[PDB]
Design a protein around this ligand. Structure first.
Ligand SMILES: O=C(O)C1=C(C(=O)Nc2sccc2-c2ccccc2)CCC1
Length: 133
């Protein structure tokens, strides 16, 4: 029910410090240049307790389906094989990805008409702002 604010089709409108975030998660030069150009969408839907987040882009297409609190395997757009757990902290979706003893945290929040994504690994923070399609 809290997930209702997130449901719909969203398209990337702005990006801050994303190159350095990609560097921190381990993305190489060529891939960062090509991925950096992409304008992914974010299609969020719900069926019972299952949340599905799909992203399509010229870089890579991804899809995850999950239940809140329940760890799952995810393959990220940059091909990390991660263990992911997504929880609701108030009305913020908090997504932790763990692999190879590392961790990154992705928060999705509604702010005005936007869906703001903050991505954090180590000292490095990037913001990806989406708006409704
Ligand atoms: O690309 C993003 O805006 C978001 C996430 C992400 O980890 N993206 C990531 S992580 C490393 C690369 C990408 C990427 C780059 C271009 C297109 C699609 C994906 C997590 C949620 C929002």
């Amino acid at each position: 029910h809290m997930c209702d604010a997130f449901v719909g089709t969203w398209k990337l409108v702005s990006s801050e410090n994303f190159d350095d975030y990609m560097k921190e998660v381990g993305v190489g030069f060529a891939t960062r240049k090509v991925a950096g150009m992409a304008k992914p969408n974010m299609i969020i839907s719900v069926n019972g307790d299952v949340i599905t987040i799909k992203s399509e882009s010229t870089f890579k297409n991804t899809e995850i389906s999950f239940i809140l609190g329940q760890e799952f395997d995810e393959v990220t757009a940059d091909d990390r094989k991660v263990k992911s757990t997504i929880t609701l902290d108030g009305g913020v979706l908090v997504h932790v990805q763990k692999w190879d003893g590392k961790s990154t945290t992705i928060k999705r929040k509604r702010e005005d008409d936007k869906l703001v994504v903050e991505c954090v690994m180590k000292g490095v923070t990037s913001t990806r702002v989406y708006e409704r399609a």
